Structure formats: C-alpha cells, structure tokens
C-alpha cells in the first residue's frame, strides 16, 4: 500500500486528464483518515461530468454515503443512499456489473443507517426487503434480531441468531453471537466453556475474539471468599496463561493487558497496576471498561478527587443517566462533608430508577447514620440541624426494620443489622440530650442580641 | 445462488472483530511483559 500512496502522490499534482485517479486515492484512504477519502470523492464526483453528460455510477455515491454513515452526517448519507438506489435502479443494461447487488449493498447501509436514526420500523422493513429476495444473506438476517433484542433478549432475537448458524456454521460472526446470548444470564458461568470451544478447531485458529471471551468468562469466577482454598489462585494462573498466549501472538491487543491488570489487582498490586493500565489508557481511553478499572485504583488510594470525575465521564455516553453499578463504586471510603451529604443525592438518583435493590436501601441508611453521628456526638453545632438530624435518624430506623424482612440479599446475609440498629437506639438518646444544648445556645444568642441592642441604644 | 458471490467478491471489510482488539498504534509487549515478569520474581 505504501507504493500505491507514493504513486498516487505523483498523479495527484500533475493533470494528465485524470478521471479515475481520485477513485484510487479514496480506495486506500478508507482505513486511514476518513476525511481524505471524502475529499477525493467530492472531486471524483465532479470530474466525471466534463467529458460528457454522464450520471455518476451508483458505486461511487454508495461509498461516499458509506463514509458519512460513520460520521454525524446521517441525513446526508441518507440522501446519498436514496440517490444510489435511484441510480442503480436505472441500470437496466448493466447486467454484467450486477446493478442488483449494488442496490442490495446500498439498501443494507441504508437500513443500517435507519436503525441508527431512531427508526427501527424502516430499518426492519428495509432489512425484510432483503430477506424476501435473498434469504442466503447473513448480515440482513443478523441485524434484524438485534433490533428485537432491545425489547428483550428472549424475543425473535434469540431465535433468529440460532437460525442463522444452522445455514452457515463456519461464520465466526454468527457463532460469536451465540455466546453473547448467554451473557445476559450469567448462570452459564462454568457451562459456557463448552459452547465457546466449538469453533476452537485449528481451521478457525487463531481467533482472538474467542480466546479472550474465554478469559472473560474465567475472570468472572473471581471475587469469591474461597481464595484460601487454593481454588481462585489456580483461576488467576489459568487466565494469566490465556492472556500470555494471546500476548505472544498479538502484542498490540489491548484486551489482553486489560485482563492482566484485573488479575494483578486481584493479587494485591494496586501500586503496580497503574503501570499496566497506562499503556491501555494511552491508546484508546474511550472504552467503557477503562473508565472503571482505572477508577478503582484512585478510590483505593484515598483519591476520590480523581475517582469521582472518571465515573461521571463514563456516564457521558448516550445510554443511561443513573446506573446502579457506577454509584456502587462511587461510595467506598467517603467521609467528607462534600462526600457524604452529596453522596446521598447520587444514591437517591440511583434508587429513583429501580428501588428494588437491597444495597441502595442499605447504603442510604449507612450514610444517614454517618451524618447523624457527625452532628449528634461532637456537636455542639447549629440549632436547626438538631431538629433535622432526629428526622433523618427516625427514617433510618424505619428502614432497619424493613430491610430485615426481605428474603434475598447481596449474596451476603444482612444479619449484622444489630450493631447499626443499636447505633440508632442510642443516638435517639443523643438527640434527646443534644436538644438541651440547643436551648442553652438559644438563650445565649438571645442574651447576646439584647446586650448588643443596648449598646446601640447608647449611640 | 450467485447473489452471494456477487457481493462478497466486490465489497471491502476495513473493520472486523479482531481489528477492534488491537490498538491503532504500535504498542508492543516489550514494555508489558517486562513488568509482567518482574512481578513474578518478587513473589
């Protein structure tokens, strides 16, 4: 490709009646910067009009719209695809170049665009118009199940994805979609190894996608209290061998190092985890995974003032507003006045979307007590706050009773509510004591204002 | 049918699954396996 670029730079300057020189320019620049292929198609579109009145073939309009599909010019790529359809339909005598396949690819990108333009009805209808004329096509049959997978992972998505595999079992795309179905419900933790080892035969080897999906389903088995039983240590060493193998054959794969940092953090090296993750961070930081893995170290080292932003930055994506798993990571070691009262606000933002979780209802209580012991022990503080503190404490104690009745827990029984409930049963007596302080302070400010008002009467 | 070989023979796949895994740049494992091996000798 280097020789084609250096040859194209020689025909670009000089003008020996260049007609197809700009086509071969953009045909290399689709992998490199996506603006360069666009600049070549703009001039290649107009250079085909000076020799004769000849319409642009659909093959150039289809590809120029394909570049704009990945960009934010979705409406303009839509006009390119509509015009590519109208032009390829006009090719009634181009039976050798198969105008029909050109309209097929243009309509495929057009339904791919409509799926992305908040319009799945038109994408479904366009993708079914390819199914009705050529059921031996795979991407149009795979992209239909994805649209229904938004409404749920048990509709015609889980059925269309397996029907595509029986017609083409040597399709790594269609078979990798199968393991993605079992990722909704992780009850197939150990049992997914079989179905992930189907296309691990040497004719498909090497496949980095499957080998790393193995390491992911193997890492999910960590975070268990059975590490002293010489069970999770073998799991760390097994996944580390998987990652070392896909490292020796691919040094530039990021995901290999991704899991390596996860295991090294599970070994207790937070100080030496930053280094491993650095290489990953530098390449592309714009992966959902990194904003989290990185964020754990900062919160680990009592650095919330770099941790709180990274959580926010993940949430900048157009997918949600109030996730549970983020905010769980958010409150770790929070003790600060801006880290406690404000932490309540984010916890409430999380419970607003789904209160059925036990841990939000538990944490909201823990924080509440934190704040209350910080006004009702050493304080000797504002008057109004004392009134408010007992209100909070009542709410907390109501929750301690309500929690206890709940069957399922966070994979850890909540039987330990006794010391927190003891720690509000005594703090009610602290509220009954410190409200006397309130009154003492009350009379103090009243006598202060009067002994000041008399000085003003002297003047 | 011929509609399969009519499209799979002219199209261009610039990105696929494995493309997503490697960096766009040049990040070898000399700066990775070095620390990976250094962590094992201290243990």
């Amino acid at each position: 490709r280097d020789i084609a670029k250096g040859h194209l730079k020689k025909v670009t300057e000089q003008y020996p009646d260049d007609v197809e020189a700009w086509i071969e320019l953009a045909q290399i620049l689709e992998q490199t910067d996506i603006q360069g292929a666009l600049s070549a198609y703009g001039t290649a579109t107009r250079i085909l009009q000076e020799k004769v009145q000849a319409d642009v073939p659909p093959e150039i309009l289809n590809n120029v719209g394909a570049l704009h599909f990945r960009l934010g010019n979705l409406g303009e790529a839509k006009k390119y695809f509509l015009a590519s359809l109208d032009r390829a339909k006009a090719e009634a005598e181009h039976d050798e170049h198969y105008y029909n396949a050109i309209s097929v690819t243009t309509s495929y990108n057009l339904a791919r665009l409509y799926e992305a333009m908040c319009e799945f009805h038109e994408a479904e209808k366009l993708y079914k118009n390819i199914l009705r004329e050529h059921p031996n096509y795979v991407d149009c049959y795979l992209r239909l199940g994805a649209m229904a997978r938004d409404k749920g992972n048990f509709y015609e998505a889980s059925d269309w994805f397996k029907e595509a595999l029986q017609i083409n079992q040597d399709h790594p795309d269609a078979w990798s979609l199968i393991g993605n179905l079992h990722l909704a419900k992780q009850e197939w933790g150990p049992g997914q190894k079989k179905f992930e080892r189907i296309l691990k035969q040497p004719s498909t080897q090497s496949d980095t996608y499957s080998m790393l999906a193995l390491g992911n389903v193997w890492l999910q088995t960590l975070h268990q209290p059975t590490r002293d039983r010489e069970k999770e240590k073998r799991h760390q060493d097994r996944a580390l061998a998987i990652y070392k193998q896909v490292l020796r054959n691919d040094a530039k794969n990021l995901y290999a190092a991704n899991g390596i940092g996860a295991v090294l953090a599970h070994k207790g090296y937070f100080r030496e985890a930053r280094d491993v993750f650095a290489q990953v961070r530098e390449a592309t930081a714009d992966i959902s995974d990194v904003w989290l893995n990185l964020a754990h170290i900062y919160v680990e080292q009592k650095q919330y003032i770099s941790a709180v932003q990274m959580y926010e930055n993940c949430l900048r994506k157009f997918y949600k507003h109030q996730n549970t798993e983020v905010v769980l990571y958010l409150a770790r070691a929070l003790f600060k006045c801006g880290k406690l009262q404000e932490c309540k606000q984010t916890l409430l933002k999380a419970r607003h979307v789904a209160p059925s979780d036990t841990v939000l209802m538990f944490n909201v209580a823990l924080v509440l007590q934190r704040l209350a012991t910080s006004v009702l022990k050493d304080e000797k503080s504002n008057l109004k706050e004392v009134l408010n503190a007992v209100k909070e404490l009542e709410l907390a104690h109501r929750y301690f009773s309500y929690l206890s009745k709940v069957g399922d827990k966070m994979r850890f029984d909540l039987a330990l509510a006794a010391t927190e409930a003891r720690q509000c049963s005594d703090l009610l007596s602290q509220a009954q004591y410190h409200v006397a302080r309130a009154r003492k302070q009350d009379e103090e400010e009243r006598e202060l204002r009067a002994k000041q008002e008399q000085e003003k009467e002297l003047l | 049918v011929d509609v399969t070989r009519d499209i799979v023979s002219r199209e261009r796949v610039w990105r696929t699954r494995t493309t997503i895994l490697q960096s766009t740049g040049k990040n070898f494992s000399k700066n990775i396996f070095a620390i990976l091996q250094s962590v094992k000798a201290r243990e």
């Binding site: 394909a66 599909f69 495929y108 995901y255 944490n363 823990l366 924080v367 | -």
Partner: peptide
C-alpha cells in the same frame, strides 16, 4: 462509621459488539 461502605469491587472486562461496517464496493 465503624467500618466502610460495603461494595463488591470486581475488575470487570467486557467485549465489544460486531462493527458491521458499510460494505465499500
């Protein structure tokens, strides 16, 4: 107070989905 906030730290690792680039004929 007594102890820190409960949280299940787990260094997760995800995988991306299929790109489905538009076919450049």
């Amino acid at each position: 107070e007594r102890s820190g906030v409960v949280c299940r730290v787990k260094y997760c690792n995800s995988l991306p989905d299929i790109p489905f680039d538009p076919k450049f004929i």
